[PDB]
Write a protein that binds this ligand. Structure first.
Ligand SMILES: Nc1ncnc2c1ncn2[C@@H]1O[C@H](COP(=O)(O)OP(=O)(O)O)[C@@H](O)[C@H]1O
Ligand SMILES: Nc1ncnc2c1ncn2[C@@H]1O[C@H](COP(=O)(O)OP(=O)(O)O)[C@@H](O)[C@H]1O
Ligand code: BEF
Ligand code: BEF
Ligand code: BEF
Ligand SMILES: [Mg+2]
Ligand SMILES: [Mg+2]
Lengths: 410, 407
RNA sequence: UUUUUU
C-alpha cells in the first residue's frame, strides 16, 4: 500500500506478501511490490520532507538518511510548489506513481497533507520571517516531580535557569561535565511533561554510541551526524532540520530542538566558509559565525502562535580560543545560559552545575513574584560560596523534598 | 612451497632445498620451478585498493609499504566479493609472466580468515550499530607480581570495556609509554581471544625493538626517523585492517603510542588554510585524527574495536594541550600520570583524581561501584604522591578483590 | 607567506 511502511517492515514479512501477491535486495523487492500494485490501478503513497532545488524542482527526503540524497526521494514539480507556495522543509505526503521509463525516482502524483494538515489553508498562513517575536511568556517546568536521583538535575535546572517557550538557551561546559547527559535528562523531562511540544534532537559531531543510546531513550525526531561525517554533511543535515522547525512554527506549532555540540557546527561552518582574511582570535574567520549565529538566533517566541526553542551545548576551557570566542558570540544572542564546572564533576558531585554563572534573562515572565524572590534569596545565599561547596550544599538541601515543598520549608 | 614461508625462511637454510629442487632472484627462481610442473603456489597479504580500481597485497615486514613480492588483485575479483582496503586475503596464485613484474592473485581461498563466499552477507562497518562498552576487560592478575600493581590501580581508577575509546595522558618521563607496554602484556595474558595490534607511530625505535620482542601479537610501527607521510599511510592501513575484522564480529584492540604525534603528522601533512588554531595546529587539521580515533566502538551485531593511545601534556607547546582536549571530547577512557609523582620514583605515577571512564556502572557491578566510589571519595583529598603511595601499599597486600573486601 | 591566524 504505502512506501515508507514497506521500507519499515522487516525483510521476511515482505517476502510472504511477494509470493501471495503473485511474484533481489529489499530495495528491489519493495519496488517490485509497488509496480504490480500500481499496474492494478491501486493507489500508492510515500512521505518525505520538501527540499526545493536551484532549478525550482524539489524532492521529499527521508529521515532515515538524515534528510540527504535517497534513491527513494519523490519528485515535486515546480508546478506542485507554486500551487501551495511550498518551501524547503515542509513535511508532505500524497499519492504517487512509480518511475515511468527513463524517470529515475518516484514522482509526487498528488498532494494530500502539507505539514500534517490541508494544503488549502497552508497558503494563507503568515510567513515565519514576518511573525512577531516576544520574550518567553508561557513556561516549561522541568521538575517532573518523581522523587528520584535524576529529578534532582531537572529541579536544579528549573531553579538555576528556568526555561520558557521560545528559549534560546545554551549549556556551557568543558568536556566531561555532564552536559550531553544533562541534555538527555532535559529531553526525557520534556517528553513526560510536554508531549504537546514537538521534539527534535540534532547531534552534530558528537559520539556515535550517544546517538544510538539517544534514539532508544528519547521519543521523537532523532537526527544525527557523527564525527565520522565531514563538515559538509553536518551543515546540510542541521540546515535541513532548522528549516523543518521553522515550517512547523509557521503552523502555530511549538517545537523544541536539542542540539549537542553547537560549537561543533560552528567549526563545521568555519571550514565550509570562504576565507575573507581578517582571521579573528583563535583562528576563527570573521564571517564564519554569521550562518551559525543565524541558526541559533532562529529560535524565538511568536505573538500569533507556536514557537521554536533551541537548547545547545557550548564548549569552554579547552586550550583553544575558538571555543571562548564562540561562547561569547552565542551568549550575546541567547536568552539563557547554564554553566557546568570541570571540578564539580571530578568530585563526582552531580549535577555539576555552576549555579553562580547560570541563569536566564527576563525571569519575571517565566515565574510568579514568590518563586522569583524565592530563587533570588537562594541566589544571594549561594553567591559567596565556592563551586563544589555551593553545589553539595544546594543538592542535599533538596535531596529530601519536592521543589515546592523545599520552598515552603526554607 | 609457500611464498610467505620461503620469504621469512633464512637465506642460508633453504640453500639445501635449492639443489634438490640474489635471494629475491632465487625466491623468484624457486617459485617458478614450483610452478613449472603445475605445483601450486600460495601467498598472503592485505589488499590495498588503488585509484585505477586494482589493488596490491601488502606485507607486515614492509610495514605495509610498497613491496616487490606483492600480489596484484584484479578489480574483477574485488567486485566478486566487493572487497575493501585492509582485508586480509590468501589463495592460489601463478608466477609473473615475462613482461609481468609482480605476482598476481590466481584465486581467492579465504577472506579475513573466513571462506570467501560469506562476504556478501556481512553488514558494513559504517552501517553497524554502536553502544557503550558492554563486556569488561580486566587487567588484574592473580600473579600478584611487583609489576601487576599498575594493572590493578588502572583497573580501579579507570575501567576498560570492549570498544573502549581510551586515552592515556602524561608529561614525558611519566611511564606512560611503558605503562602501555604493561597494558599490552596484561590483555595478552587475560585475553588471547582479542585480536591484538600495536601501532607505534613516530615515537622512538628502541621502543619498537623492545615492544616486538616482548609483545604477543602484531607490531606495526614507524620510527620518528620516517617522514610524516608514511606515519599517516601506515596508521591508515592498520586502522582499515582493524575495521575489516570488526565487520567479521571479531574483537580488535589497538594500543597506539604517541597519538599526538599522529595528529602532528596529520598537521605537517595537510592542505594550507588561512586560519590556524592555538599552538600552531591548523584549524582544519584534526578531522582525520578524530575519525581515526573515533573509529573504536562497540557493536550489537557482534565484535568490537578498542583504541587506547598515549597523549602528551605540559609539553611546552599548546598544540599538545589543545590536542589533548580535542580527543578528550571524543574518547571515554581518559588517564593521567604526573611528573611530580614519577619524580619520587613512585609508580604508577597515575593521578587518580583526574583519571576516570564514562558510564562505569555498566562495566562494574553494584558492589564494584560502591567500593570504587567510596575509594575515590577518600582519595580525592590525598595528594598524588601521598594518595598513590597510600593505595599502593594496600594493593601490595592483596589483588584488588581482597583489598577492597578487607577494607 | 607578509599582515590576520600561532
Ligand atoms: N549526573 C550524572 N550522573 C551520572 N554520571 C554522570 C553525571 N554527569 C556526568 N556523569 C559522567 O560523566 C561522563 C561524561 O559526561 P557527558 O555529559 O557525557 O560528557 P560531556 O558533558 O562532555 O558531553 C558520563 O559518562 C558519566 O559517567
Ligand atoms: N612503573 C615504573 N617502574 C619503573 N620505571 C618506570 C615506571 N614508570 C616509568 N618508569 C621510567 O620512566 C621512564 C620514561 O617513561 P616512558 O613511559 O618510557 O616514557 P614516556 O612516559 O615519555 O612515554 C622509563 O625509561 C622508565 O624507566
Ligand atoms: F566532552 Be563533552 F562531550 F564536551
Ligand atoms: F548579550 Be548582550 F546583548 F551583549
Ligand atoms: F619522550 Be617521552 F615519550 F615523553
Ligand atoms: Mg558531550
Ligand atoms: Mg613515550
Amino acid at each position: 500500500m504505502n512506501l515508507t511502511e514497506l521500507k519499515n517492515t522487516p525483510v521476511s514479512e515482505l517476502i510472504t506478501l511477494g509470493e501471495n501477491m503473485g511474484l533481489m535486495r529489499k530495495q528491489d523487492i519493495i519496488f517490485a511490490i509497488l509496480k504490480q500494485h500500481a499496474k492494478s490501478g491501486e493507489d500508492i503513497f510515500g512521505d518525505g520532507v520538501l527540499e526545493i532545488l536551484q532549478d525550482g524542482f524539489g524532492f521529499l527526503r527521508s529521515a532515515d538518511s538524515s534528510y540527504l540524497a535517497g534513491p527513494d526521494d519523490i519528485y515535486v514539480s515546480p508546478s506542485q510548489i507554486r500551487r501551495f507556495n511550498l518551501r524547503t522543509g515542509d513535511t508532505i505526503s500524497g499519492k504517487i506513481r512509480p518511475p515511468k521509463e527513463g524517470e529515475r525516482y518516484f514522482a509526487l502524483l498528488k498532494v494530500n497533507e502539507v505539514n500534517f494538515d490541508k494544503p488549502e489553508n497552508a497558503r494563507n498562513k503568515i510567513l515565519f520571517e514576518n511573525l512577531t517575536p516576544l520574550h518567553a511568556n508561557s513556561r516549561l517546568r522541568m521538575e517532573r516531580g518523581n522523587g528520584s536521583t535524576e529529578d534532582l538535575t531537572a529541579r536544579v535546572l528549573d531553579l538555576a535557569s528556568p526555561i520558557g517557550r521560545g528559549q534560546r538557551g545554551l549549556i556551557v561546559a568543558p568536556p566531561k561535565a555532564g552536559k550531553t547527559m544533562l541534555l538527555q535528562n532535559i529531553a526525557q523531562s520534556i517528553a513526560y511533561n510536554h508531549p504537546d511540544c514537538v521534539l527534535m534532537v540534532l547531534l552534530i559531531d558528537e559520539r556515535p554510541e550517544e546517538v544510538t543510546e539517544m534514539q532508544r531513550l528519547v521519543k521523537g525526531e532523532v537526527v544525527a551526524s557523527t564525527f565520522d561525517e565531514p563538515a559538509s554533511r553536518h551543515v546540510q543535515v542541521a540546515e535541513m532540520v532548522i528549516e523543518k522547525a521553522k515550517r512547523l512554527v509557521e503552523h502555530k506549532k511549538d517545537v523544541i530542538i536539542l542540539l549537542d555540540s553547537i560549537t561543533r557546527l560552528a567549526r563545521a561552518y568555519n571550514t565550509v566558509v570562504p576565507a575573507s582574511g581578517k582571521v579573528l582570535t583563535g583562528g576563527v574567520d570573521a564571517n564564519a559565525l554569521h550562518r551559525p549565529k543565524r541558526f541559533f538566533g532562529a529560535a524565538r517566541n511568536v505573538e500569533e502562535g507556536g514557537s521554536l526553542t533551541i537548547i545547545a551545548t557550548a564548549l569552554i576551557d579547552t586550550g583553544s580560543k575558538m571555543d571562548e570566542v564562540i561562547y561569547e558570540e552565542f551568549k550575546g544572542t541567547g536568552n539563557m545560559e547554564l554553566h557546568l564546572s570541570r571540578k564539580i564533576a571530578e568530585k563526582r558531585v552531580f549535577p555539576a552545575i555552576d549555579y553562580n554563572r547560570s541563569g536566564t534573562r527576563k525571569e519575571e515572565l517565566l515565574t510568579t513574584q514568590e518563586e522569583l524572590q524565592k530563587m533570588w534569596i537562594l541566589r544571594k545565599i549561594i553567591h559567596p560560596m565556592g563551586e563544589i561547596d555551593a553545589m553539595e550544599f544546594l543538592i542535599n538541601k533538596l535531596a529530601m523534598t519536592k521543589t515546592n515543598d523545599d520552598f515552603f520549608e526554607m
